[PDB]
Each structure stands twice: as structure tokens, then as C-alpha cells.
Amino acid sequence: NSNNLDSKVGGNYNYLYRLFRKSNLKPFERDISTEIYQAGSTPCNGVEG
Amino acid sequence: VKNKCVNFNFNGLTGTGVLTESNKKFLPFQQFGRDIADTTDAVRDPQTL
Amino acid sequence: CVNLPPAYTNSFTRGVYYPDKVFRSSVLHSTQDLFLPFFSNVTWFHAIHVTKRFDNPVLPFNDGVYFASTEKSNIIRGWIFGTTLDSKTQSLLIVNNATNVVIKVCEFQFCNDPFLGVFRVYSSANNCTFEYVSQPFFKNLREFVFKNIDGYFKIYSKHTPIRDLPQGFSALEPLVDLPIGINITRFQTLLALHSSGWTAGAAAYYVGYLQPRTFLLKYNENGTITDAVDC
Lengths: 49, 49, 231
Known about the structure:
Chain A is mostly loops. The first copy, chain A, has no helices and no strands. Chain A is flat and about 45 Å long. Chain A: Residues 1-49 are annotated as: Receptor-binding motif.
């Protein structure tokens, strides 16, 4: 545990996790892509709604 | 200690036997001998090489 | 960033590549692994200007690749590896800038016609997660083998001083292993020429693909593979 180093008195938002991927990863494989994830079948053009 | 029955530990590999000089020549990416039955029958000393 | 029917062959018995780092002598070892099957259709590409040929397309990296090149004047430099070769994904690169061996993994934006001069390979580099740059680094064959398993990118190599593929036997020794950790689907070779001016080139490289097989390998009294059988 590191609740005295990584936690601040107003919220620490410098640690991130990836939600909304199209397929599950493989062993020891990395991914730092940030491309808008499309839930439905309608296309996406870099806009979020 | 050559030519005597000794228990040994070569880089974490234990066992007991008699150690003798060899004419075999390894390659710079090899360390063990692994006879037909998957048993070691040769090793490279990590100091004298 | 400037712009600019293939042949087939046999690949009799090549691409064996010692599987483990254990010494063995005077035995017959059966092992399953990703091998290049015997007597397989092997694409062929040219660079001779009799005819103004600079063919070097994008091929797919199915499950590993065998590469060969019979040249004389050091015209093939390196390779690229990725899935979509733009800045939306991470990509690998190997090259020899006439004195070096440069390996790196970034988010390059590659030109549609990369090449060098005998530097026009990429137009950007943003997220470097790896770097391996080093010191100032038809007669020969220079066989290679590339694989990508469990995040590790493995390479095997071999040289043989010597217009077809010489049908001998030579086992490839391990060279390096890199922890890149990326999804690779395609690759592309890098060449150096001498826009509308370029000539004096002859590379004649060959490619092949691997699949899972079971081989029977033979070791001599000195620990050298001198034969193999495809089961």
C-alpha cells in the first residue's frame, strides 16, 4: 500500500487506466494508443457524444 | 576439487559426483551439457571459464 | 519524403535456427517449433537496372519471417514492423546509417517510399519506449529469422560466403532478443539507392513464412547441426 505517497488531500488524477478496448490484450503486450472508441455502429470522427 | 566424489552447487544446480577435465568446446551462449536422458554431463566454471 | 508479377522459388532446406541454448553431441533430438517447411514457395524480388527495378512492397508478418539477400554492395539496410504504419500505433525500426545499428520503438509517421542514399525513412518520432543505438557499425547470403512471441521479439542470423538459393545446410545461431511489447502484423524492407535519378543497384532478396512443425535434428561429435528431417 502507498496511501501516504500517491494520495493527495484533494484528489490525485495522475494515474490512469484504459477502459473501452475492442479486444483483450496479449501477454506482456503494451498499448498507449488514444483513439476514440466507438460503441455503436455509427461512425466516429474524433468527436465524443 | 577434481577427481573426488563431492556434492556441488554450480550456479544453483545441485548434485553429487566426480569432476574431470573435458576436451569439449562450447559456444559463448552455452553453460550445460544435458545428456540423452536430459542429465548434465558437462558444465562451464563461471570463474576459470 | 519524396516519391519514386513477382517470381517464386523453392527454399530446399533452410531456416533451422538452434532451438535451445544447451550443448548436445552425437544425438538425434526431436523438437516442435515454428519452422520454415521444406520445399516451399518463396517469393523473389529484384533491384537490377538492365528495366528500372526498385520493388519493395508491404508484406504481412503472419507468424514470423525468414529473410535472405544475395548482394555485393551493401544495398539492404533494415526493416520496419508494425500493424498500421502511421502515428496512430507504435512501430519498430532497424537500420544501419553507414555507421551504426539503430533499434527503437516509437510512433513514427512513415513515408510511402522510405529509403536512404548511397535519410528519408520517417517524418516524426514521439513516444520512444525503447532504444538500442550502438557504436559505429553476389558473394554472401546473410540469412535472418524474425519472430514475435510473448512480447519478446527474437532474431536469428547467419552468414555464408559464396541466381538461385544455394542448396546447402547451415543452422542459424541466436543473436538477440528484445522486450518491445507490441502487436506486429506487417513489415517493409529498407534499401539504399544511388526525384528522377537512381541506378547501380542489385539486391535480389528472398522471403518466406513459418508455421508449427516437428523436426528431427542431428548433432555431430562437436555439437553442430548437420542435417534435419521434416516429420
